[PDB]
């Protein structure tokens, strides 16, 4: 059943699995009309499909054209997510297909189970974990490719850059979740921490700055401080 603190280590075993996050699939700006009513304008979205072991990110860009003339978009978004994940599984060679797909939101279970009926051996699972994958659009290069897309497009990233050369997938996933948690809690502060020292750059083929092991420890410390501060602010504690 559900992925939690108790069965966390399963993410880093040799059974292929993907997390699916649908939180950036359907995105809108809410605005006033000339008549003083409210209307939404859709903006480009993305499915965030992540192998937590390898760092391989299958970023399916959701172009605003897919909503044209459709009703109940928040509901269609779950089904479009399920259709795109199903199409991605079918596109992969058999030996690359996931054994499990973990959805970050329970509303994705039935849409994905129904789209994956052809794959009875792929387990569709919820999680108790509060994963900050909504903050994926606070990574500049992912936000850039989504907003510039003029048609539906799949872009492949490694969300861990070259980290797995130096650290395990457990530690890579912990770094990623701490960066995304920071970006989600206080984006300005998080991005200031990541880019304050111009001598550390982002390689053209990477998402994050090229920190030494020592500079990552300092960065990770600054992110934890950012998160606890904002927590004491939120909750006046």
């Amino acid at each position: 059943g559900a992925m939690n603190s108790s069965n966390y280590a399963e993410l880093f075993n040799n059974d292929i699995k993907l997390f699916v996050d649908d939180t950036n699939v359907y995105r809108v700006t809410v605005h006033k009309t000339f008549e003083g009513n409210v209307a939404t304008k859709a903006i480009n979205g993305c499915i965030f499909t992540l192998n937590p072991k390898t760092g391989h990110l299958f970023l399916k860009i959701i172009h605003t054209s897919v909503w044209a003339g459709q009703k109940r978009l928040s509901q269609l978004a779950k089904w479009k997510t399920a259709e795109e994940v199903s199409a991605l599984v079918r596109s992969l060679p058999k030996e690359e297909q996931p054994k499990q797909i973990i959805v970050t939101r329970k509303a994705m279970l039935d849409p994905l189970e129904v789209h994956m009926l052809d794959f009875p051996n792929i387990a569709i699972r919820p999680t108790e974990l509060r994963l900050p994958f909504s903050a994926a659009m606070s990574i500049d290069k992912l936000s850039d490719v989504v907003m510039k897309a003029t048609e539906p497009q799949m872009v492949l990233f490694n969300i861990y850059d070259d980290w797995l050369d130096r650290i395990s997938s457990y530690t890579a996933f912990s770094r990623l979740t701490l960066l995304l948690r920071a970006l989600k809690t206080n984006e300005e502060s998080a991005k200031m921490i990541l880019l304050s020292d111009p001598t550390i750059t982002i390689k053209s083929y990477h998402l994050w700055p090229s920190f030494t092991d020592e500079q990552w420890i300092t960065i990770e410390s600054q992110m934890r401080d950012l998160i606890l501060t904002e927590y004491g602010r939120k909750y006046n504690v």
């Binding site: 089904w79 129904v114 009926l117």
Partner: protein, 300 residues
């Protein structure tokens, strides 16, 4: 009017005949049930006073032969049997009637309850759900599992209800995943009605049979089947108007008949709330919604 004679009543038992029931004492001189309306299926059911576990019973149609009950002291139950000798049978029934050893099927003239619960229920269809082709009557009990329950063990003693599964390839056409899951009209009308049942009469027949097995034997698998067949119609945006009107009547009589005290185990809260308040057909079951709201407002 037909008769189901009993050889004897060696053990104390509650005997059911359709919606009626009678207590019989150990070795009470009881020789059966007379004045049974021709034209309907019937069920004669049993709960031993000493083991209220295993409600069991026999679906039969008196037009298909001469049936009697005889206690089997080896298997420890009241067994239905066919008497092939018509003259031996008329002779036995005439004797027991003359000595007034029989209870009368206690139908009220005004009362269409049993007709309304069994309108579409056919003995030929029961015998396909309950396979035992050497007998013209069908045994059901509390513990019998459904073909579907066995997939999720002995296939000989199974209820062969039509498998309904909303998250199955059968229910969902490739490339109509969201449409077919949110509006089950395709599954109801093409797969189930046109494809398997052939008409709404056979569909309602199985629905009605599932309910009666749930109510009389507390058969859990039958209760699941009854709810699934209701939910498939209520979850379809496109249903023939005549099916909706008839479903309202069918369900009205089922809810009317259900013992008030069994509502908590025989009624699925999720399915009823969905069918009366969220589903496409939420405004199509007036009679059923009025009786449910007045009789079981707690469930809703």
């Amino acid at each position: 009017m037909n008769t189901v004679p009993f050889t004897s009543a060696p053990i104390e038992v509650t005997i059911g005949i359709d919606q009626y029931s009678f207590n019989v004492k150990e070795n009470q001189p009881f020789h059966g049930i007379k004045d049974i309306p021709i034209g309907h299926v019937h069920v004669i059911h049993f709960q031993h006073a000493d083991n209220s576990s295993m409600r069991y019973g026999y679906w039969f149609d008196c037009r298909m032969g001469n049936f009697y009950i005889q206690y089997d002291p080896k298997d420890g139950l009241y067994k239905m049997m066919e008497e092939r000798d018509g003259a031996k049978f008329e002779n036995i029934v005439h004797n027991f009637k003359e000595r007034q050893m029989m209870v009368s099927y206690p139908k009220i003239d005004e009362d269409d309850t049993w007709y309304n619960l069994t309108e579409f229920v056919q003995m030929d269809k029961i015998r396909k759900i309950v396979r035992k082709d050497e007998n013209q009557f069908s045994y059901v009990d509390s513990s019998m599992t459904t073909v579907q329950e066995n997939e999720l063990s002995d296939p000989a003693h199974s209820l062969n209800y039509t498998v309904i599964n909303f998250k199955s390839r059968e229910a969902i056409r490739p490339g109509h995943e969201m449409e077919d899951f949110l509006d089950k009209s395709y599954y109801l009308n093409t797969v189930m009605l046109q494809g398997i049942f052939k008409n709404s009469s056979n569909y309602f027949g199985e629905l009605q049979f599932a309910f009666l097995n749930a109510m009389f034997f507390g058969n859990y698998g039958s209760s699941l089947q009854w709810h699934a067949m209701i939910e498939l119609i209520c979850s379809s945006a496109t249903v023939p108007k005549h099916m909706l009107d008839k479903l309202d009547e069918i369900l009205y009589y089922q809810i009317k008949t259900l013992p008030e005290q069994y509502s908590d185990i025989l009624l699925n809260e999720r399915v009823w709330n969905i069918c009366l308040y969220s589903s496409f057909q939420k405004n199509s079951l007036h009679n059923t919604e009025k009786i449910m709201e007045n009789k079981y407002p707690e469930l809703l």
